[model samples]
Target: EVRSQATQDLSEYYKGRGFELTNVTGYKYGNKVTFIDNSQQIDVTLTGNEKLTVKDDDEVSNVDVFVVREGSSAITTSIGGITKTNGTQHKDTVQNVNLSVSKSTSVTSEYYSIYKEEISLKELDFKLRKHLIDKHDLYKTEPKDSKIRITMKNGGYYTFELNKKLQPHRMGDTIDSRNIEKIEVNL
Candidate 1:
């Protein structure tokens, strides 16, 4: 019941806009809905309830959007920390080559929440992007590398990498769209 009802609401909601309902799949909470606007080259995902993801993953251009329901949700500011390691071997284990190890630490932030209200997609496109950039510490000089990864509730994900400068890398650069499960930064 919840799944079908939510799907109905989303279908009508997005249909009124320029998007068309493309697919629906079963999700843990309910039904996961997908809406697409071929003309605009944009796609949106609604995760059961309480979440929306909009993405334009053009090879040459990439713009991302992620939003969750308002109120005290089960989310935290950051995931504490993360450590990534990568390496390459030299020759064989002939007691010749040199060994090197490098480890990096970072933090990932949860998605931003939104109030339940009525708003036009046009307004949302810009408003969400503006709010995202305005509230976040994207301009800080501490984190040299920043990555915003948006994950669909069901599956799949898109990542946007930005430098500390954050010049042409603002949120409104391209097709705007999701729950940003993890925001990785060298903090």
Candidate 2:
């Protein structure tokens, strides 16, 4: 619903300005829409938390997305990249085999569990992995301007509208792999 709302919001926004939606890649946590004109192509992406991003070639811009109320037309949010960190690795030797260094980070900390309880990275697919990590980074750096709040649960993730004191009022199922599917839509 959020993805479509974003697509709707963006599609209308661009159409009003005379651009056409050329292609769109929709995911659970994000949506990337490509718009083209005579001279250039513009990409607008909306993340799970409603952070809106616009990119053309290598240049980038950010926008705010808002919601009036549940079931109302909503709009705005940021993009951030992932960083590497050190991890512990123990070596096991057998026969004459020598230990080698392993630097890859397969599973991350609870901070990455923005949508659900901390789970092994192996459980997440590629698109989800990218979404979770990027949103986690955004939460770390961006201000608490967004009303959306996601809480951890044993079943799965749930949505919330938070109070000024950080109290949560349940909304519904969050954007997940089950919901986000690849589809085509017009601008």
Candidate 3:
């Protein structure tokens, strides 16, 4: 029972701190995704979609894609005209793949899982990824701030609030602001 007690104490010590250990386990919707101890558990949703204009060597097409898992499931799905004679492949995931759907599509899924997990941003980095969409542009705002008065494609932005210790509390979506980082929003 000593080990159990030690584990409990250890957990409490790390619980309210960022140094807490992460487990490579399935999310109960507790976080957008989970990564720890070399395990990457990606969980996102395909909420909506947008049509991207892809131009390839005199060929242009509107590629319709469904943005998922908070839109990180959203990738720039199409574009072309970069050749290296052949393909070496997947040098990375989060790094510009520079690929396309190429006018062909197919799918088969009569079944999908509905787990109790994989729904909330109860975790930090997971929520961070979802908010920034892996971008470094994070900010804090107030209702009176001009930034909050902006348009939602005139698209707004994702804001993360903080806790007493200054960790992100939850995510927010403004949904428009052509000038995000700078806005006067005058009368």
Candidate 4:
């Protein structure tokens, strides 16, 4: 009927628009009509999800529909392998897409207080210990339970909790927050 004629005309229309149409097929499926354009070595899949939406006609614009399930957890990571912790909105320019995580909890003061201070101390201790043993040739034994009392320029002093058990002081290897920097839990 008209559907078959219309499909043929649609392929010709795309060919007129500098798109080399190939492998034209027809299907009578659920509510939606699907078409794949393999023209000019480009693969474009078009789908109409609902019955109310217009089927593939010469006048209709090709549209793609994607359904994301509700209550799905997605973890977005940066190109440098850093898991994105903060920020509500993220955009990927290369992919020409914008991703937003909804209902994300805010970073509480308690979380930051524990996170920043511990991370700072762990990194600092690992670097200091490594520098001391490798460069200065001092403290040949492993830096276990090595307390790093950090005193800011102001009159504040904080002590770090380190394990006097590990051998090499490496970030994320032996010197972890739980084992190495647990005493200075508060910021």
Best by lDDT: 1
**Clash pairs (backbone) in predicted model 2:** 51-77, 64-76, 65-75, 65-76, 66-75, 66-76
RMSD of each: 20.1, 18.9, 19.9, 25.7
TM-score list, all predictions: 0.24, 0.16, 0.18, 0.22
List, in order, the clash count of every candidate structure. Answer: 5, 6, 17, 3
Task: Score residue 76 of candidate 4 by CA lDDT.
Answer: 15
Model 2, 17-100: lDDT tens per residue? 221121223222234433233443333343333312334453222221111111212221111111111122222211121111
Query: What would the TM-score be for candidate 4 when compared with the true structure?
Result: 0.22
- In model 1, which regions exceed 4 Å deviation? 1-111, 114-133, 142-144, 163-187
What is candidate 1's lDDT per residue for 1-187, written digit by digit as tens?
1234433433333223221121222122122222122432222332222212333432211112232222233321110001111122342221111111112443334434422121223323333334334454323232234443434334555444433212221322221122222222222
lDDT of 3 by residue, 1-187 (tens): 1224433432232232221122122222222322222343333221112111233343212211111122123232111111111122332221111111111143221211111111122232233223322232222211121111212233543332221111222321111111232211110
**Candidate 4 CA-lDDT value:** 0.26
Error of 4 at 11 (Å): 69
- In model 3, where do residues sit more than 4 Å from their true spots? 1-38, 50-147, 152-187
Q: On lDDT, who's better, 1 or 4?
A: 1
Give the Å shift of residue 41 in candidate 2.
9.9
Candidates 1 and 2, the one with greater TM-score: 1
Off by over 4 Å in 2: 1-22, 25-34, 37-154, 160-174, 179-187
Stretches of candidate 4 exceeding 4 Å from the true structure:
1-119, 141-146, 161-187
